[PDB]
Amino acid sequence: RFASVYAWNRKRISNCVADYSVLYNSASFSTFKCYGVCPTKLNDLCFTN
């Protein structure tokens, strides 16, 4: 279940390993577009949240 856009799930991710599984290379997505980061550098970078 996903929300219609009226509301949306906003679950926060913290205190974990954000293995991003190179999802951009999975071809399971039609869109995978990053803006402030390079999609290939996501597994090197850390976030507070």
Next chain:
Amino acid sequence: KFNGLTVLPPLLTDEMIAQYTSALLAGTITSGWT
């Protein structure tokens, strides 16, 4: 130093300056201007 700033030593150390100064005083005191 983290950004490439290097300080170089002088050729004449304080000890050598002190020797030149001492020589000038010795001259001034024992032989005047000669």
Next chain:
Amino acid sequence: FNGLTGTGVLTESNKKFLPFQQFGRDIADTTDAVRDPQTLEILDITPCS
């Protein structure tokens, strides 16, 4: 570490960090020292010659 990627010589520090500080800087805004994320030893960072 957790970021602060860089190159230098890591040595034991004599600094007393407050329990919440984790990181530390110089006058120049450079990294002075880092608390090791594991075991919490404080290490000073000296630039390589």
Next chain:
Amino acid sequence: SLSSTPSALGKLQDVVNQNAQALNTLVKQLSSNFGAISSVLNDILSRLC
């Protein structure tokens, strides 16, 4: 006179102080963004594509 009046040697102290400031300024200007997203070259290299 030289012992009791610290201003007596002000000319030599001033030469030292002006050069120290010129270098400290050079060091601090280094951390300005100058229109960049970050003054840290490593942040640009680590996250930006």
